[PDB]
C-alpha cells in the first residue's frame, strides 16, 4: 500500500524531455497497447531512484536483461535488406562458454530470492501457516535450481540459433536496443503527397 | 603572448600500470585512504552519496558478479544519511582488495599493461573472444608500443572492431552508460583516413580530436540526446584549457583541440558544435552548474547566432552544415605541427579547416552560479536609440519576489540604545517672545502636523523595522549558542528583552544551559518597549556616562510611566534580576498587574516617587491646546517633584510648550532645574516626539529656554498643508525616454532576448536595476529598479538617448545572475544618514533655483561625481568644477552640461562674476582638494574670500554649508556613535576624516561686518519627507535619533546679491 | 492625519506563481528550511503540534490519497513531546516533493496560474467536471486578467458556480 | 606545491620613490620606452611562467590542510584578528564562530560546511587587505575593519573575495563591504571600467584589481587606467591600485597627474605583496594624502619596476622542460 | 476548452452593420431556428479571425 | 483511472481493524491456523469488494 502509493503518485508513465531527462507525467492513467508507438514509456520500468516507495523500484531492476546485442555482421556483408542506419539485434543471453554456473541462471537464483524474501514479508505479514510459507517456499525454490540446469544448454545452444537468426534474409529492422526504458521502435511510414499516409 | 606551448601527455596511455607489478594494484594489504584513492560525497540532494573511484581505477568496469558484492547496496541503506565512513571504507576496501586482474608478469623494462582492454576482458567472465583470448593466452596484453598494443589483439583474433563499453564515474549509479568506446583496429593514417570516412553512416558516433594509445577509437551514442550530454560537457571543457593557451601557459593536455566531431550528429549536436570551435566566452573563473550545463550551451547557441552578426552570422551557418571538419585556429594548428613532426606515426584528425583568428566578436559573459546580478545601468553609451516600443515587465509572481515595506533594519545590536542631548540655549525668554510661540504652536495642534510625515512613523514602526535583527538574538539562545554575556552588558539586556523564562548565569559570561527537553517563548515587544527599554539605557547612562554595568545599582528603583506597560518593566526585573532590592513599577491606563492602573491626571492623595520615573503617557487629551498644554504640564509637574531624574516623553512639543515646562519648574523650586531633550536611538525613525530630561543640578544654568533646537525643529516646522503624500508605486510598463513616470520601483518580468533592450532602455529612469533567472528553463528576466530622481534629472537633460545596450548584448543567453529561491525586495531602501543628508540639503536649494527670475547656469563649485545635478532644472547648464570628474569631453556634452576641473578657492583669481549663475558650495570649505582637513581657522577664510568675491559682482547667489560647532559638545554627550562620533574635536562624518568646524557666529559677524545679503538656512521637515518620500528610501533608527541634530547643525549660507 | 492612504493588494491573486516554473514550486531537490518554509510547534497543551504550511502553499487541499502518506501518521506517534525536528523535515519534505500540479508550461510572460483552482483539481482526482476539465486540457489553467482566469473555466462547462 | 606556514603568506614591500624631479627630457625617452613594450608584450618565456605558475593551485594543498582538519574538529585556538583566524575562514563556506575567543564553537552535529571556493585572486585580494589593516600603522595583530569603517572591492569577479571579508569581519559593528568590476555577481555592484557618472563611491580603504587589458594600444589605455587610480584616488583615504605594466612612465604618470589635482602631492608605495602569482609583474600603487609633502616622488629603477620594465621580450621561444629517459 | 472560451465570449452570434462590419453581440445565448428569419447569423461561421 | 478511492478506502480500512484483530487474537493466544483462516477471509473481500 505505502509504496505503490508515493511512486505511483509520481506519474503512471513517463515522456521524454530534450535534454533527455525523464519527465513523468502526473495522472496514474491505465495503459492501453494502442498508445505503445508514441513518446510515452510505461513509468515501472524507467529504473529511477523514487526516494520513498523504494521496496516497488528495487524488486523492478529484475526484469533487466541479460545478452548483449551483437551487429549482425555476416547478413550486412552478405548485403541483405536491413534497413536501420545499422542493423543489429539483441540476443536474450551470453553464450557462457567458460566454466562454472552461468551469469544468466546465476542471476535467476538471486532473483528468485530477493523476491523470495519479498513473498516472506508478505505471508508473515498476512499470519500464515509455516506449513504453507515453507511448502511453497519450496516451491519456489526448486526451479532456482531447477532453471540452473535447462539455463545451461538453452542459453549455450539456445542463444547460437539468435546469434544466426538476427540475421535471416528479409527479417530485417532492430527489434529492441537493450535498454527497456527507452527504447522506442523507428516509425516508418509510407507518405504520400497524394492521400493520407 | 603568441605560439601556444604545450605538452601532450596521453594521460590514459600512461596510467596503465607495469605488468610485473600490477598486482600489488589493487592494493591485497593496505586500505584505501580517502585522501587519494578515492573522493566521496552526500549531497543536500536528500540523497545522493556519490563515490568517485580516484586512481588508476578511475575507468573500470565491475560485471554481474563485482555488481553483487555489498558497496552496492551499502548505498540503499543510509538513504538518510552519509553512509558511516567507516562501513565505507573498511567495506569498499573488500571488493577492491577482489579484483584480480588476470596477466602474466614479466621482466622487460619496457612493458606496460593496456589495463583498460583487459579490466574489460574480466568484466564479462572472459566469453566475448578479446576476453577468451586474454585468459589463455595471458602475455598477449603487456606491449611496448602504445599502439602496437591492441593491433596485436586484432591481428590475431582478426577484427575491424572491438567496443570497449564505457561506465560512468560514481560506483554507484548502475543506470546504463551514455555511450561507448569502440576501438578502430586502423594502423597507417591513410586506413583511418578512410575508417572514419566510411562512419558517416551509423547512427551516431562521434569522435576526439586526437587519440589515446594513438589507435583510433570512436564514441557510439546510444541515444540522440545523450550524445548531447558528452559534447556539453566537452566543449564547455575546451573553452576551460583553450583560455590558458591564448594566455600562453604551458599546457599538459591529453591533446591541443579538445573539442569533439559530430561525425553523424543530428541538427541540435549540429549546432552545438557549430558553436563549439567559436570560442565565445571571456575567460570565467566561476564554476559552472552541471547537468543543466548542456542545456545552458545548447541555449547560448540559438542566441549567439541570434544576435548573430551578419558575417559572422554566414562565417557560422557554414560550419553548421560542413562539421564533419574540424574548425582549429591558426595557433592551435602550428602546434599540431610540433606533433607531427616529432614522430610521423601521431594518427591525428584527417578533414580540418584552419580559420584566421575568426571575424571579431562578444565575450558573452557567462556563468551559472547562483547569485542574481546587480547591474549598475550606464548613463550614456553609444547605440544612439531611435526610439523602439514601451516595454511590458510581466507579473512577479510571489513565491520568486514579494516587495515589503521597509528593509528591515539590520544593525550591530549594541549602538541601539543610543540618543542625543540637545542642551538648553537662550538666557531669556521674554514675555515678546510668548506672544509669538503661543499662537504658532496653537496654530499647529489646530490643525495636525504634515500628513506625509504622520503617515511616515506609522508606516515605519521602530518595531517591524528592528525586529529580525532582535528575532535573531532570541533564535540562536533557543539552540544555545550565546555563551557570553556579563550582567550590566547592553548585550545582556537584549537577549533578555527577546526572551520570555527568565535568563539566568553562573560565574558570569556562562549562562545556565537551557534546562534539558524545554524551550522559552520568544518574548512578546509592543513597539514601545524597545523604546523605553532605551530610555532606561539612557538613564542609568545618563547617571554618570562613562560606566558599562547597567544593573539599578543596589537598593534604588524606579517606576515606569507609560500606558500599556510591561514587557517593558517585566524585561527590567528580569535583567536586575538578582540585584538587591530594585522595586520597578508601572502606570497608564490599560496597564495590566504587576501595574497600578491609574488615569492621566494623578488620583489625589496616591504619592508617588522613586529615584528615576520614566513618563511616556500624556498622549492626546481632545482639550485642543489651552488645557491640553496644561494637562500635561500637569504631568511633568508630579513626574517632575517625585524624583531625583526621570525622563518624560512630551510630546509635541514646539518652542512653546517644551519651553513652558522650563519656566514652571523655575518657580517650583527657585535654583531652576537642569534638563535636556533625549532624543533616544531607537524610536520610530521619524516621530518627532522628545523625551525632556529632568534633574535637580546644584549650580543653576543661566541659560534653559530653547530658540533652535535640533529636537523641537523636528516638530516646530512640519507645518502641514503638504496637498497630499506620495504613496510609493510599482508600475511596470517601461516607456521609451519620457519623464512622465511617478517615484517607486520597477518590479517586472521581461522575456530574455528582450533583457538587453529592456535594462538598456531602463537606464534612463533609476541606476541600478538587479534581476535574476530561476533556472535555465526559464525563459523570462526578472528586472527590478526603483526609479531615482537624480538620475532623471540627468538622463534627460538636453533631450537626446544613447545607451550602453549591445555591451548588454552579451549577457542575454546566460550571465543574468541566476538565483533560486524567493527574494525580498523592500518598497523602501535604506541609506547612511550622512547620504540621506546632502539628499536633504539638495531638497531646500532646488525648490531656490526654481525661484529668482532669470538664472542662467548653475557653476557647482567642487562637486565630485555631479551630485548638485538633481538640483538644477532641465535646462540649465550645469557646470562642475571639480579637479577629479574625468568625464569623456563628447559624452559631457551630449547631456550639455561643462567640467572645469581647476581648483582654486580664491578671489582676484576666480571669476565668479557670470551673472545670472547660481554657485553651490556644497562642502567644499571642508577638506582640502588633496582629500584632507581644512583647518577651521583656515575654513574660515574660504567664506571670507567668496564674499569679497559675491561682493563685487551681481545676481549671483552662492550656497556655502558649513558646520557650526554645536555639534561637538551635544555629540560628546550624545552616545549614537553611529556615523559622527567625535575625534577631538571634529567629527569623522561617515568616510572623512575628521573635520574640525566653527563658529556660526564668527560666520554671520564676518560677512555681516562686510555687507552680503545672507540667510543662514537649513532643511526642514517639509523637505525631508519630500526628498526621502520620491526615494523609496527610509530613515532607520540611528538615523532619525541623530539626523535631526546633524540636520539642523549643519546649517547653510545662501550668500545673495 | 485624514483622508486614509492605503495600497491595496488582492494578496492571492498575486500569489499563484508564474507558470513556466510552476514545477520547482514543490522544491524538488532542496529541504524546506523551517525558516520560510512552514511554521510549527508543541504547545502545553499537552499535545498540540501544529504545523503551518507558511508559503505558496498557505491554500492547499489534500486528498484521500495525500491524506495517506506519513506526516499525517507522523503526529500521532509523538503524543509526548515535540516531533523530532528531523523526522519532521526530512518527512515532510517528502510528500511535498510529491505533490505534482499538472499544468502545460508557457513563455509568454504575463501568464500565471490560478493555482488555487488547480492545487483543487488535484485535490479529488479530476473527477469533478472543472477538474475533468484541467486534465485533457492544462492550458485552461493558466491566465492573464485576474478574472477572465475563471470566467474561462465557466464559460467552457457552463456553470453558476464552482464550489 | 608551496607549502610554508600559513601566518608568512600576508607579506609585500613597500619600493618607496626616490626621484626629486622627473623632469621633461625624461618623459620624451620614457613614453617610447613604455610605449614599445605595449606594442610588443613581454617576454613570451616569463608570461608563459606566471600563468602556469597560478598562487592559486601553487599555494592551495596547504591552505586545503587547514580546511581538512577544522572539518573534523581540530582547529581549536584562534584570535578574530588572527591572521591564522582570516585564514581558516578563507578557506571554509559555512559561518565561523567563537566564543571567550580561542574556542571556535564545535561542527553542529552532524554536519559539514563545504570548503571555500577561492578564484586563485582571492588569495591575493585577501591578502592586500591584509597589508591594508596592516600599513594603517604597522605594529597591531587586530586585523578586523575598526569599529564602523568599510572599504569597497574593486575587482573584476569579485567574491568570495568579499565574502571572506565579512565572514572574518562579522561581529564587528558597522562594516560595510562592496565589490563592484564587471562579471561580478551580487552582493556586488556590477559596474563597467569608465565609471559611469553620477555614481559616487568612497569608503575609507579601496582596492582596485580591474583595468586589466584595453584594446587602446597604449596612449588610450594609459589614459583609461590613468582615469582609474584619478576616482579610485580622490574618492577615499587609502587604497590599492593595481597598476598594471607599469613602466617608469605610466606608473610615474600616475604620481604628476594626483600631483596637480591636489596641490600637496600625495604619498604613493609601490605594495609587492606576498601571495601573487611568484612573477607577474604586476604591482599595485599604495596611495595616500600624506600631510607633509614628500619632495621626492616619481621613479627611477624601482625593485618593482624593472620586474617589468626589462623582460624587453623577442626570447625566441621558450625552453619547455623535457623529460628524456636514455 | 481554452479557445472556446475566448470565441464563445467574443460574441456567440453577430449581425451584419450597415457597413458590413460585423456587430459582434457579447451574449452566447443558444439558437433557436426561431431567429433564422431574423437579423442574426450563427457566430460561429462568422469566418472572421 | 485505475483503482478507485472508494475501494481503496475499505482496502486501508479493513487492514486497520484486522491490524487490529491481530493484537486481540495474539492477545488470547490462538492457534496460527485461524489467525490466519479469519484473517484470510477478512482478506478476501478486500479484493473482493474492489
Same mark, same amino acid.
Given at each position: +500500500?505505502?509504496? /505503490? ?7 503512471? @508513465?513517463? &515522456?521524454?524531455?530534450? %535534454?533527455?531527462? !525523464? ?63 545499422? +542493423?543489429?539485434? /539483441? ?7 567458460? @566454466?562454472? &554456473?552461468?551469469?544468466? %541462471?546465476?542471476? !535467476? ?89 | ?1057
Amino acid at each position: +500500500p505505502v509504496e /505503490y502509493g508515493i511512486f505511483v503518485q509520481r506519474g503512471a @508513465t513517463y &515522456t521524454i524531455n530534450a %535534454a533527455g531527462e !525523464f519527465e513523468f507525467s502526473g495522472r496514474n492513467e491505465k495503459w492501453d497497447q494502442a498508445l505503445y508507438l508514441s513518446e510515452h514509456f510505461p513509468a515501472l520500468f524507467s529504473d529511477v531512484p523514487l526516494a520513498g516507495a523504494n521496496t516497488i523500484i528495487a524488486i523492478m531492476r529484475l526484469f533487466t536483461p541479460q545478452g548483449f546485442l551483437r551487429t549482425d555482421d555476416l547478413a550486412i556483408a552478405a548485403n541483405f535488406p536491413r534497413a536501420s542506419r545499422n +542493423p543489429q539485434t /539483441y540476443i536474450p543471453y551470453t553464450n557462457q562458454r567458460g @566454466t562454472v &554456473t552461468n551469469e544468466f %541462471a546465476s542471476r !535467476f537464483r538471486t532473483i528468485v530470492a530477493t523476491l523470495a524474501n519479498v513473498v516472506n514479508e508478505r505471508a508473515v505479514q498476512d499470519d500464515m501457516q509455516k506449513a504453507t510459507r515453507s511448502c511453497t517456499k519450496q516451491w519456489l525454490r526448486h526451479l532456482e535450481t531447477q532453471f540452473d540446469n535447462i539455463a545451461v544448454a538453452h542459453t549455450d545452444h539456445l542463444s547460437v540459433v539468435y546469434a544466426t537468426m538476427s540475421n535471416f534474409m528479409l527479417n530485417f529492422t532492430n527489434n529492441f536496443s537493450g535498454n527497456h526504458a527507452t527504447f522506442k521502435p523507428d516509425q516508418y511510414v509510407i507518405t504520400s503527397p497524394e492521400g493520407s499516409y | 603572448m603568441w605560439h601556444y606551448t604545450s605538452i601532450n601527455n596521453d594521460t590514459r596511455v600512461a596510467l596503465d600500470p607495469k605488468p610485473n607489478q600490477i598486482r600489488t594494484i589493487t592494493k591485497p594489504n593496505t586500505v584505501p585512504q580517502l585522501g587519494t584513492d578515492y573522493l566521496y560525497t552526500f549531497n543536500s540532494q536528500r540523497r545522493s552519496h556519490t563515490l568517485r573511484l580516484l586512481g588508476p581505477f578511475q575507468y573500470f568496469n565491475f560485471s554481474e558478479t563485482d555488481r553483487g558484492h555489498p558497496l552496492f547496496r551499502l548505498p540503499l541503506k543510509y538513504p538518510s544519511k552519509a553512509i558511516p565512513a567507516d562501513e565505507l571504507i573498511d567495506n569498499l576496501h573488500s571488493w577492491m582488495r577482489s579484483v584480480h586482474l588476470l596477466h602474466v608478469r614479466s621482466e622487460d623494462n619496457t612493458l606496460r599493461y593496456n589495463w583498460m582492454l583487459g579490466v574489460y576482458a574480466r568484466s564479462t567472465n572472459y566469453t566475448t573472444p578479446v576476453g577468451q583470448l586474454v585468459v589463455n593466452a595471458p602475455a598477449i596484453l603487456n606491449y611496448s608500443n602504445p599502439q602496437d598494443a591492441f593491433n596485436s589483439v586484432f591481428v590475431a583474433l582478426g577484427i575491424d572492431y572491438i567496443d570497449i563499453p564505457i561506465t560512468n564515474s560514481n560506483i554507484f549509479d548502475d543506470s546504463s552508460t551514455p555511450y561507448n568506446v569502440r576501438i578502430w583496429h586502423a594502423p597507417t593514417m591513410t586506413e583511418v583516413n578512410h575508417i572514419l570516412a566510411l562512419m558517416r553512416k551509423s547512427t551516431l558516433v562521434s569522435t576526439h580530436s586526437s587519440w589515446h594509445w594513438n589507435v583510433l577509437h570512436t564514441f557510439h551514442y546510444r541515444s540522440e540526446s545523450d550524445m548531447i550530454d558528452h559534447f556539453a560537457a566537452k566543449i564547455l571543457e575546451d573553452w576551460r584549457q583553450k583560455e590558458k593557451l591564448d594566455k600562453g601557459a604551458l599546457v599538459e593536455a591529453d591533446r591541443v583541440i579538445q573539442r569533439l566531431i559530430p561525425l553523424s550528429s543530428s541538427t541540435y549536436v549540429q549546432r552545438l558544435a557549430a558553436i563549439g570551435a567559436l570560442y565565445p566566452n571571456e575567460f570565467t573563473e566561476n564554476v559552472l552548474d552541471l547537468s543543466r550545463l548542456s542545456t545552458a550551451l545548447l541555449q547560448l547557441s540559438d542566441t549567439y547566432y541570434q544576435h548573430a552578426n551578419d558575417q559572422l552570422r554566414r562565417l557560422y551557418r557554414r560550419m553548421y552544415n560542413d562539421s564533419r571538419t574540424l574548425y582549429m585556429t591558426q595557433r592551435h594548428q602550428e602546434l599540431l605541427l610540433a606533433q607531427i613532426t616529432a614522430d610521423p606515426n601521431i594518427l591525428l584528425y584527417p578533414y580540418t579547416y584552419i580559420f584566421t583568428t575568426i571575424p571579431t566578436s562578444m565575450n558573452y559573459i557567462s556563468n551559472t552560479g547562483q547569485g542574481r546580478i546587480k547591474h549598475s545601468l550606464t548613463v550614456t553609451g553609444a547605440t544612439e536609440h531611435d526610439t523602439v516600443a514601451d516595454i511590458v515587465l510581466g507579473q512577479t509572481g510571489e513565491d520568486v519576489i514579494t516587495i515589503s515595506m521597509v528593509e528591515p533594519m539590520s544593525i550591530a545590536v549594541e549602538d541601539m540604545y543610543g540618543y542625543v542631548l540637545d542642551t538648553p540655549t537662550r538666557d531669556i525668554w521674554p514675555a515678546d517672545e510668548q506672544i509669538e510661540q503661543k499662537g504658532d504652536a496653537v496654530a499647529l495642534y489646530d490643525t495636525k502636523t504634515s500628513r506625509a510625515l504622520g503617515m511616515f512613523n506609522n508606516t515605519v514602526r521602530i518595531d517591524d523595522l528592528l525586529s529580525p535583527l532582535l528575532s535573531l538574538v532570541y533564535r540562536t539562545y533557543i539552540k544555545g549558542d550565546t555563551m557570553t554575556m556579563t550582567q550590566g552588558s547592553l548585550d545582556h539586556l537584549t537577549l533578555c528583552a527577546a526572551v520570555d523564562s527568565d535568563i539566568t548565569f553562573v560565574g558570569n559570561r556562562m549562562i545556565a544551559p537551557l534546562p534539558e527537553g524545554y524551550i522559552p517563548k520568544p518574548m512578546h515587544r509592543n513597539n514601545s518597549t524597545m523604546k523605553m527599554l532605551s530610555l532606561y539605557v539612557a538613564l542609568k547612562k545618563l547617571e554618570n556616562f562613562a560606566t558599562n554595568s547597567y544593573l539599578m545599582a543596589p537598593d534604588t528603583s524606579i517606576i515606569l510611566l507609560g500606558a500599556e506597560r510591561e514587557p517593558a518593566v517585566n524585561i527590567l526585573r528580569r535583567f536586575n534580576r538578582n540585584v538587591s532590592n530594585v522595586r520597578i513599577i508601572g502606570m497608564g491606563d490599560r496597564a495590566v498587574e504587576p501595574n497600578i492602573r491609574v488615569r492621566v491626571p494623578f488620583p489625589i492623595d496616591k504619592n508617588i516617587s522613586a529615584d528615576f520615573i520614566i513618563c511616556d503617557i500624556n498622549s492626546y487629551e481632545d482639550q485642543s491646546f489651552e488645557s491640553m498644554f496644561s494637562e500635561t504640564i500637569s504631568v511633568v509637574t508630579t513626574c517632575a517633584s517625585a524624583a531625583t531624574r526621570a525622563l518624560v516623553k512630551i510630546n509635541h512639543p514646539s518652542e512653546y510648550m517644551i519651553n513652558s515646562v522650563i519656566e514652571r519648574l523655575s518657580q517650583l523650586g527657585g535654583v531652576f532645574y537642569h534638563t535636556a531633550l533625549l532624543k533616544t536611538a531607537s524610536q520610530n525613525p521619524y516621530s518627532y516626539e522628545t523625551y525632556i530630561y529632568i534633574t535637580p543640578i546644584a549650580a543653576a544654568v543661566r541659560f534653559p529656554f530653547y530658540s533652535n533646537s535640533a529636537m523641537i525643529n523636528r516638530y516646530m516646522t512640519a507645518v502641514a498643508d503638504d496637498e497630499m503624500p506620495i504613496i510609493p508605486s510599482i508600475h511596470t510598463v517601461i516607456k521609451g525616454h519620457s519623464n512622465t513616470y511617478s517615484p517607486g520601483l520597477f518590479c517586472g518580468c521581461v522575456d530574455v532576448q528582450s533583457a538587453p533592450l529592456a535594462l538598456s532602455q531602463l537606464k534612463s529612469y533609476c541606476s541600478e536595476a538587479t534581476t535574476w533567472r530561476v533556472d535555465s528553463d526559464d525563459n523570462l528576466v526578472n528586472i527590478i529598479a526603483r526609479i531615482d530622481p537624480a538620475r532623471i534629472a540627468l538622463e534627460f537633460r538636453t533631450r537626446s538617448n544613447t545607451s550602453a545596450y549591445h555591451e548588454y548584448q552579451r549577457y542575454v543567453p546566460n550571465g543574468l545572475g541566476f538565483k533560486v529561491r524567493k527574494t525580498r525586495e523592500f518598497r523602501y531602501m535604506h541609506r547612511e544618514v550622512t547620504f540621506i543628508h546632502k539628499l536633504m540639503m539638495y531638497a531646500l536649494i532646488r525648490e531656490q533655483i526654481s525661484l529668482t527670475e532669470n538664472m542662467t547656469q548653475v557653476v557647482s563649485i567642487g562637486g565630485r561625481n555631479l551630485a548638485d545635478i538633481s538640483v538644477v532644472p532641465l535646462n540649465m547648464k550645469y557646470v562642475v568644477i571639480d579637479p577629479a570628474t574625468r568625464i569623456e569631453t563628447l559624452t559631457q556634452e551630449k547631456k550639455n552640461i561643462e567640467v572645469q576641473s581647476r581648483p582654486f578657492q580664491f578671489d582676484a583669481a576666480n571669476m565668479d562674476l557670470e551673472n545670472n549663475s547660481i554657485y553651490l558650495f556644497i562642502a567644499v570649505i571642508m577638506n582640502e582638494p588633496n582629500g584632507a582637513a581644512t583647518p577651521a581657522r583656515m575654513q574660515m577664510d574660504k567664506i571670507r574670500n567668496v564674499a569679497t568675491a559675491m561682493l563685487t559682482r551681481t545676481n549671483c547667489v552662492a550656497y556655502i554649508s558649513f558646520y557650526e560647532a554645536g555639534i561637538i559638545t551635544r555629540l560628546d554627550q550624545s552616545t549614537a556613535h553611529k556615523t559622527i562620533r567625535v575625534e577631538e574635536g571634529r567629527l569623522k562624518v561617515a568616510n572623512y576624516v575628521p573635520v574640525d568646524t566653527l563658529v556660526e557666529a564668527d560666520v554671520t559677524l564676518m560677512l555681516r561686518d562686510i555687507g552680503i545679503t545672507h540667510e543662514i538656512i537649513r532643511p526642514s521637515t517639509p523637505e525631508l519627507i519630500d526628498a526621502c518620500s520620491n526615494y523609496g528610501i527610509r530613515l532607520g533608527s540611528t538615523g532619525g535619533a541623530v539626523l535631526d541634530v546633524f540636520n539642523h547643525y549643519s546649517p547653510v549660507i545662501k550668500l545673495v546679491r
